[PDB]
Design a protein around this ligand. Structure first.
Ligand SMILES: *C(=O)[C@](NC(=O)Cc1cccs1)(OC)[C@@H]1N=C(C(=O)O)C(=C)CS1
Length: 358
């Protein structure tokens, strides 16, 4: 019953905010098809603007879930295949290392060591091309997983090319609108500026900066309500009336690669439920999560497994986000904060809450 929810959430999150000195935070728990919302603190400290259910947070790397699903939808539409070579979409990518790198590799960080970020010196499309052309792999395609915004980013930009739409147009018309995420943005419009929290880094108020392939890797700003709706859409894709979008959501939770007890989806990462909590909490530390690891191909990919812990962490310089959910149990959580605090604290809090509700 809802008292269970309130009790575990309050007991769990109030110490976390105190320990991590989080200025503002929004949490949603999704339980049996219903969301339950909790907010604390300030969206803007200087102006004493409180966090509310309409406050926008930067998702950072959680945006990659949207990118994964938008790709999944382009696959379902027959516009692209994950088996296609990158060069089919960017024929200017002629350097020899691109021979053998597929869209699957890009989408799943397995191209052979594309880096965590696109370098800050890349400001133009010619700078981008030069970057990928000069890039030297460390491993053969499909052999090591190295978590990389420059990999999934490129996938995003390539995956929308056949549509004829920009990445933002594709995401708005094919994902945001059908799911009725009407307070979810890649570019925040004037009507929402008042709701857009500041991030806090070493005490300074900050917003994410423009960057190459930002829309694709870390584009999205959203509210706790819309994120709870994103979680629900991903927990229960069969309720989605748009067929290609339903299928895309399912494709993003297919298991493509395994490393240790983790399975790579498109954006999403997955473990079998029940999980070992120490494995996901410690696994979330950047020392571990950003390290290169050999992967085993799952040939062919396993379709979305209901008994999974499905999750993704995200950060910008000012923001820390986490989404997890367990489809078999109709259970999930969203944690949005306007400080970047360590991932294991997010994941530990989330597990404490969801495990209690299972
Ligand atoms: C995902 O969260 C991450 N970064 C972002 O999404 C957005 C940015 C963070 C800093 C500038 S943009 O991968 C793309 C995280 N980035 C970092 C990083 O600082 O490079 C991490 C240490 C974890 S993954």
């Amino acid at each position: 019953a809802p008292q269970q929810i309130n009790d575990i959430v309050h007991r769990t999150i109030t110490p976390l905010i105190e320990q991590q000195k989080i200025p503002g935070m929004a949490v949603a728990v999704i339980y049996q098809g219903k969301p339950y919302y909790f907010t604390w603190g300030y969206a803007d400290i200087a102006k004493k603007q409180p966090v509310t259910q309409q406050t926008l947070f930067e998702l950072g790397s959680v945006s990659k879930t949207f990118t994964g699903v938008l790709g999944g939808d382009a696959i379902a539409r027959g516009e692209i295949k994950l088996s296609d070579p990158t060069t089919k979409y960017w024929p200017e990518l002629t350097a020899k290392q691109w021979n053998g790198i597929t869209l699957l590799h890009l989408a799943t960080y397995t191209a052979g060591g594309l880096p965590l970020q696109v370098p800050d010196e890349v400001k133009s499309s010619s700078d981008l091309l030069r970057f990928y052309q000069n890039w030297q792999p460390a491993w053969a395609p499909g052999t090591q997983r190295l978590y990389a915004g420059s990999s999934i980013g490129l996938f995003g930009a390539l995956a929308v090319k056949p549509s004829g739409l920009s990445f933002e147009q594709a995401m708005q018309t094919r994902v945001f609108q059908p799911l009725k995420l009407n307070h979810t943005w890649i570019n925040v419009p004037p009507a929402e500026e008042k709701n857009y929290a500041w991030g806090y880094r070493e005490g300074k108020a900050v917003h994410v900066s423009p960057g190459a392939l930002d829309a694709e890797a870390y584009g999205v700003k959203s509210t706790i309500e819309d994120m709870a709706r994103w979680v629900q859409s991903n927990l229960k894709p069969l309720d989605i009336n748009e067929k290609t979008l339903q299928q895309g959501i399912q494709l993003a939770q297919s298991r493509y690669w395994q490393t240790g007890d983790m399975y790579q989806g498109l954006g999403w990462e997955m473990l079998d439920w029940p999980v070992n909590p120490d494995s996901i909490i410690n696994g979330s530390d950047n020392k571990i999560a950003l390290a290169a690891r050999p992967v085993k191909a799952i040939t062919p990919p396993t379709p979305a497994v209901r008994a999974s812990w499905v999750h993704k962490t995200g950060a910008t310089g000012g923001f820390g986000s986490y989404v997890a959910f367990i489809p078999e149990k109709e259970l999930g959580i969203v944690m949005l904060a306007n400080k970047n605090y360590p991932n294991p604290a997010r994941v530990d809090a989330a597990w404490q809450i969801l495990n209690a509700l299972q």
